[PDB]
Amino acid sequence: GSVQIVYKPVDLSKVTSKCGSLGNIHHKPGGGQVEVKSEKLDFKDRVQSKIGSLDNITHVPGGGNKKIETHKLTF
Amino acid sequence: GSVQIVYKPVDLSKVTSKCGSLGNIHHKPGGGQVEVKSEKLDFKDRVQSKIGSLDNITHVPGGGNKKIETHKLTF
Amino acid sequence: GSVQIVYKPVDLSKVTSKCGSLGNIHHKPGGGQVEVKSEKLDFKDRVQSKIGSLDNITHVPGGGNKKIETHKLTF
Amino acid sequence: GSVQIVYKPVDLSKVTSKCGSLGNIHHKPGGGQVEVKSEKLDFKDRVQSKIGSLDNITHVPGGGNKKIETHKLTF
Amino acid sequence: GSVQIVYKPVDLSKVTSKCGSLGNIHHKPGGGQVEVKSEKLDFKDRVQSKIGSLDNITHVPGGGNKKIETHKLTF
Amino acid sequence: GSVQIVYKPVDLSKVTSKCGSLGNIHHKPGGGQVEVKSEKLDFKDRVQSKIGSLDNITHVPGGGNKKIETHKLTF
Amino acid sequence: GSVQIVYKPVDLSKVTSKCGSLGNIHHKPGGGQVEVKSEKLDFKDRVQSKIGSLDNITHVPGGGNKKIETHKLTF
Amino acid sequence: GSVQIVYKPVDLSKVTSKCGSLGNIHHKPGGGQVEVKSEKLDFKDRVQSKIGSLDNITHVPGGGNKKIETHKLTF
Amino acid sequence: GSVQIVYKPVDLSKVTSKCGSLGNIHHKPGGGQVEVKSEKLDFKDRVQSKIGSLDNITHVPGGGNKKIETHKLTF
Amino acid sequence: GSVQIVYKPVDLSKVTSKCGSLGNIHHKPGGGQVEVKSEKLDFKDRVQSKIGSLDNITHVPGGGNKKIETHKLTF
Amino acid sequence: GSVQIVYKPVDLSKVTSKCGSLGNIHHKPGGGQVEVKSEKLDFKDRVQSKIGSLDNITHVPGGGNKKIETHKLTF
Amino acid sequence: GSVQIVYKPVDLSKVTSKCGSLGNIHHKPGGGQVEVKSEKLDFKDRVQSKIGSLDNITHVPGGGNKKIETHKLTF
């Protein structure tokens, strides 16, 4: 008498992660038409101002891919 | 007498995550038509201001992919 | 006498996650037509102001994919 | 006697033209769920056919911008 | 006696043309789920066919911008 | 007696033309999930077929910008 | 007993095909009698015109002859 | 007993194909009598014109002859 | 007993193909009688023209003759 | 005193003669289809006969062109 | 005193004669299709016959061109 | 005193004659398709015949061109 065994599992799967700011930004202040223009700014004590500025702030403690796998046969 | 065994599970799945700011932004203040223009700013004491500014703030814990799998055969 | 066994489950599934801000933004204050214009800002004490301004705050815990699976045969 | 003349017409206009195909289309045939599917096509003699398709062709004669202007002063 | 003349017409205009294929199309045939799928095709004599397809062709005469201007002063 | 003349027409304009194929197409045939798939194509005599395809062709006469201008002063 | 067999089908045919442009055309513009003639032609901008012309273009994939024949005797 | 067989099918045929441009054209512009003649042509910008011309082009993807024949005797 | 077989199929046919441009054209522009003649032609910018011309081009993918024949005798 | 003479008559005429039988001849008796052919003719004594025959008889005196002309100047 | 003479008549005319039969002949009797052929003719005494024949008979005196001219100047 | 003479008549004319038979002949009797062939003719005493024959007979006196010209100047 006799025995015959074949053992061969297969993994062909695929996995993706994408994280953070993935978009697009278009910013354009003051693109007008004017004949005569005049601007006068006067700032004194502990003043703060932002005029036509852009701040992009991104951080990502996230995001890993992880796998644990175990195979065994005994006879 | 005889015995015959074949063991082969298969994984062909696919997995995706996308996280955070995924949109698109268009910003354009003050793009007019004017003959005569005048702007006068006078700021004195502990003043804060924003004029035409863009702030994008993004953060992302998590957003990962995790798999655990275990196989055995015994005879 | 004899025995004959075949063992092969299969996974062909797919999974998707999309999380956060997904829209599109269009913002455009002050794009008019005027002959004569004058603007006059006068701030003394502890003023906070925003004339036209855009900010996007996005944050996203979780949003991930998790799978656990186990197979055994005993004969 | 004396004379003083000042001559200054001004143009501050804007002009735009957009021509052709600008719209939005969504088309998605046959995207179902079924256990067993079979298809059996047999086309013999001078046959014309279309299955799940879209046609886009564009001609633009027109759509330009034109201006003519004249200025005269005689003393 | 005396005379003084000042002559200064001004142009501040802007002009734009966009012509042809600018829109949005989404097309996605056959994107289903099935266990068993079979297809037999048999095309014999003077056969023309389209399956799952999209056609894009563009011609643009015109779309241009043109300006003519004349200035005269005679004393 | 005396005369003084000042002559200074000014042009500050801007002009744009864009012509042809600029829009968005998304095309994706056959993107499904299946366990068993078979296809059997049998074509004979004067057969023309398109399966899953996309065609792109562009011709542009015109789209140009043209300006003519003349100035004359006579004393 | 006895048998005698004679087998002789006969074909004496003729077959003809003529395809495309076979007809008769007479064209003869401007063939007159005149004492004095003068012609002034002045074309500026994006003009198309025709005077006294003839167009001949021919496509023929078709028009062939085909025959299939089979003979069998079994004793 | 006895047998005699005679087997002699006969083909005496003829077959013809003629394809494309076979017809008759007569063309004769301008053929007059005149004492004084003058022609003045002034063509400036993006003009196309035809005067007294003839165009001849031919494509023939087929027009062929084909025959298939089979003979069998079995005793 | 006895048997006698005679086997002799015969082919005496004829086959012809002619493809392309075979017909008759007569062309004769301008063929008059005149005492005084003048022609003045003045062409500037991106102009195309034809005067009294003839164009001839031919392509032939088809037009062949094909025969297949088989004979079998078994005793 | 003085005398000034110029003498120049001009001939630009054209003349044509065409005379007789103006065609081309096509003749084809007996081109039929028949299974079995037999025809019976019995002529004894001084018979004359014509069957399917063509006689073309043409003759042309004259038909020519003649011109006679004379010039003189005397002083 | 003085005398000035110029003498120059001119002939630019043209003359044509065509007479008789100049055409083309096609003759083809008896080109039919027949299985079995026989014809029976019995002619005995001083018989004349024509069957399917072509006679073309042409003759042409004259048809020529003649010109006579004379010039003189006497002083 | 003085005299000035110039004497120069000019001939640029042209003359054509065509007379007789100049053509092309195609003759082809008896080119048929037949399985079995026979013809029976019995002619005895002073018989004449022609069957499918071609006779072409041409003769042409004249057809020529003649010119006579004479010039003189006397002083």
Numbering used by the authors:
A (entry chain A), B (entry chain C), C (entry chain B), D (entry chain E), E (entry chain F), F (entry chain D), ...: 304 to 378
What are the paper's exact sentences on this?
Abundant filamentous inclusions of tau are characteristic of more than 20 neurodegenerative diseases that are collectively termed tauopathies. Six tau isoforms that range from 352 to 441 amino acids in length are expressed in adult human brain from a single gene by alternative mRNA splicing. Tau filaments consist of a structured core made mostly of the repeat domain, with less structured N- and C-terminal regions forming the fuzzy coat. Here, we report in vitro assembly conditions with recombinant tau that replicate the structures of filaments from both Alzheimer’s disease (AD) and chronic traumatic encephalopathy (CTE), as determined by cryo-EM.
We found that reducing the shaking speed from 700 to 200 rpm was important for the formation of filaments with the AD fold by tau (297–391). To show that this was not only the case for tau (297–391), we assembled tau (258–391) and tau (297–394) with a shaking speed of 700 rpm. For tau (297–394), besides structures similar to those formed by tau (297–391) at 700 rpm, we observed an additional filament with pseudo-21 helical screw symmetry that comprised four protofilaments (filament type 34).
